[PDB]
Design a protein around this ligand. Structure first.
Ligand SMILES: Cc1cn([C@H]2C[C@H](OP(=O)(O)O)[C@@H](COP(=O)(O)O)O2)c(=O)[nH]c1=O
Ligand SMILES: [Ca+2]
Length: 129
């Protein structure tokens, strides 16, 4: 897998963000995670967490996995990094997302994320509290 550049256009919610990628605006949906919707418990906290992470970053990157790069809604499917830190993993590690939507061929970072979820759950963090 390869990191590629992108620039923040707008935070949207915990697991979706609007980025400029190859010069085009796209909504990205973060691979392998599920945040609560804004309307649901921890939803605002997930949204706040991702927002700060992407807004505070000097450098945003996206990393596609080996399989589909866009979903049925035309959202980009990627791992995203804020100054070298994976947003996907960080959400899970904080108990603000569950590992989810694990599809064959787009799951390179599955076990990394499951390990973070296990640590979050052990800490009884947020969603696991
Ligand atoms: C994360 C992810 C979601 N999706 C689709 C599956 C779900 O379809 P449905 O909308 O039919 O439920 C939806 C979940 O996204 P959200 O959690 O953003 O709603 O997005 C993918 O197809 N691939 C993916 O890797
Ligand atoms: Ca969601």
């Amino acid at each position: 897998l390869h990191k590629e550049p992108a620039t923040l256009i707008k935070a949207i919610d915990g697991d979706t963000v609007k980025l400029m990628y190859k010069g085009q605006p796209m909504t990205f949906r973060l691979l392998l995670v599920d945040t609560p919707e804004f309307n649901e418990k921890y939803g605002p906290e997930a949204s706040a967490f991702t927002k700060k992470m992407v807004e505070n970053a000097k450098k945003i990157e996206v990393e596609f996995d080996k399989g589909q790069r866009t979903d049925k809604y035309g959202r980009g499917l990627a791992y995203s990094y804020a100054d070298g830190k994976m947003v996907n993993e960080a959400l899970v590690r904080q108990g603000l997302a569950k590992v989810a939507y694990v599809y064959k061929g787009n799951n390179t970072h599955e076990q990394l994320l499951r390990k973070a979820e296990a640590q979050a759950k052990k800490e009884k963090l947020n969603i696991w509290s």
